Amino acid sequence: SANNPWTGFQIFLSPYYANEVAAAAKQITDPTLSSKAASVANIPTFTWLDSVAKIPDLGTYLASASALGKSTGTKQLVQIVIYDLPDRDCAAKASNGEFSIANNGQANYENYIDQIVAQIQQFPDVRVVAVIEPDSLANLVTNLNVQKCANAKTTYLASVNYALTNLAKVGVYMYMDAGHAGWLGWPANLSPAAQLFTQVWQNAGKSPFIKGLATNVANYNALQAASPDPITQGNPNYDEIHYINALAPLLQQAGWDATFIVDQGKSGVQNIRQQWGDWCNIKGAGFGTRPTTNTGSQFIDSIVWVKPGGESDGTSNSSSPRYDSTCSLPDAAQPAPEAGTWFQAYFQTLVSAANPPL
DSSP: OOOOTTTTOEEOOOHHHHHHHHHHHHHOSOHHHHHHHHHGGGSOOOEEEOSGGGHHHHHHHHHHHHHHHHHHTOOEEEEEEEOOOTTOSTTSSSOOSSOOTTTTHHHHHHHHHHHHHHHHTTOTTSEEEEEEOTTSTTHHHHOTTSHHHHHHHHHHHHHHHHHHHHHHTTTOEEEEEOOOTTTTOSHHHHHHHHHHHHHHHHHTTTOTTEEEEEESTTOOOOSSOSSOOGGGTTOSOOSHHHHHHHHHHHHHHTTOOOEEEEEOTTOSSOSOOSSTTOOSSBTTOOOOSOOBSOOSOTTEEEEEOOSOTTBOSSOOOTTSTTOOGGGGSTTBOSSOOSTTSBOHHHHHHHHHTOSSOO
16 A cells, blocks of 8 residues: 555564563573574564553553654654453463453453553554454354354454544554464455455444554464465465455455555464464474565565564463463474463574574
8 A cells, every 4th residue: 555554664672572582592502593582682573462461561662662763863663462352262272361251341341442542642653553353353254153252253343343443543553363364364264254354344434544454463374385385275375475365355345455464473484283273382483584564465564573472372281271272282382381471492493493594
């Protein structure tokens, strides 16, 4: 499109990720791997607002970015993930997250959004890009047979709508999570996906700030693959570019000239999964293409690092109440700590296996 949210902006670099990376570079036993590892702190990632407790961090990042913009004469951009739906991750093998549908969950979620908006409202000289609710809407395409998803459908739709409607009022550029090629990119899933995303866009008033969709968040697919990963057999859309090329025209037909962002943080190494749906801490993952607007696709505004690579996808401890057996499959790195916490051994492999090399 004409307006790429990133062009002309300096991304604010997460100080939290930078601190994790610096401490990790100290713990890596090879010295030459260490310089490459340390340089990861200069690579922009998204900050996940995975609880109300993270909202004050958003406020600090906005204020810090603004001051940095004034010091350097630049316009700064803060990258966030909205990730706190009630009954979050409805098709997972355990519950997670602070809000539940049964306990005022939607109303609590609205207040979470209100608190985020109230922060953003105070810092109008900082641009914000938000990924809206990974692992949410995509379940309402393919997983309506999971009873938790069926019973969450109206709440997911209302809560995502509230986020889009109210973040638009403060000019946040938004990309709604849309799974990946192996989830919604199957040709047969493209039409019901478009019907869903278009209805969501319509309900939120078709705001121009609703730019489009985010794909491959926290996942491992190639953007462009010279040969299909064997996990993809049966799906002609074997990488993210095929998925996006196929979905974008369906959105266009509804009057939404949608653009896309693609996570490549954990995509440096292909052909590592037994089954396409295996998502948790896949062994051998490497850091992929660094964030850039030089994407090679009319539809794609940016390659991004949405998941902060090195932070666990979930625990492999079957005694934890947060245990999802996906995190113990033969292709999941084990033992793995709780989601979001630092996974040093996994980071070290992301660095060593980074492609392009760091």
